[PDB]
Amino acid sequence: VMGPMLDAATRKPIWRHEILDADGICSPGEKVENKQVLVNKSMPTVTQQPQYKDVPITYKGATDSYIEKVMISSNAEDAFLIKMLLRQ
């Protein structure tokens, strides 16, 4: 998960990465609009330096939604499962 891509012009995150926290995960309490990313996920393309391409989880919705909780669990396969609870 990559951090929020801060805009060098205003030293603030862009409108798309505005709701992301320092760790790139959207924090509860804020409102999510249409075409906004919740997890700035980047995955390698090799499977010498790894080449990560971004595949963020954009929110498809006509109306706004508020993040209530963000649960992060770890499975036995070292896989991190992130669940964000949107409310309307």
Partner 1 sequence: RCPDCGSTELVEDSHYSQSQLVCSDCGCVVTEGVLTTTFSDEGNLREVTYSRSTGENEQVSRSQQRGLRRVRDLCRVLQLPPTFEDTAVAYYQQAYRHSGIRAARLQKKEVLVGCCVLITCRQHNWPLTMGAICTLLYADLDVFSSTYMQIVKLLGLDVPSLCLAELVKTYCSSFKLFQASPSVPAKYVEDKEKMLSRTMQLVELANETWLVTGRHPLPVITAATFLAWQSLQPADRLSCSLARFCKLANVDLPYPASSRLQELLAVLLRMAEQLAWLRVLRLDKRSVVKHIGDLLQHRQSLVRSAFRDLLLPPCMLKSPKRICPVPPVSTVTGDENISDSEIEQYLRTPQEVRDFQRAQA
Partner 2 sequence: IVQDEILAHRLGLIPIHADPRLFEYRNQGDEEGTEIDTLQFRLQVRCTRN
Partner 3 sequence: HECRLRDMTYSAPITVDIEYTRGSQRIIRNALPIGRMPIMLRSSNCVLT
User: In angstroms, rounded to a whole number, what is the distance separating the alpha carbons of residues 17 and 56?
Assistant: 10
Parallel, antiparallel or unpaired: strands 65-74 and 52-54: unpaired
Would the CA dihedral through 78, 60, 40, 38 be positive or negative?
negative
Beta carbon nearer to partner 1, 22 or 77:
77
**Member of 12, 31, 35, 69 binding partner 1 (CB under 8 A):** 35
Contact region for partner 1 (CB under 8 A) — 4-12, 22-30, 38-46, 73-81?
73-81
Residues in contact with partner 3 by CB under 8 A are 71, 73, 75, 81, 83
Residues in contact with partner 1 by CB under 8 A are 35, 76-78
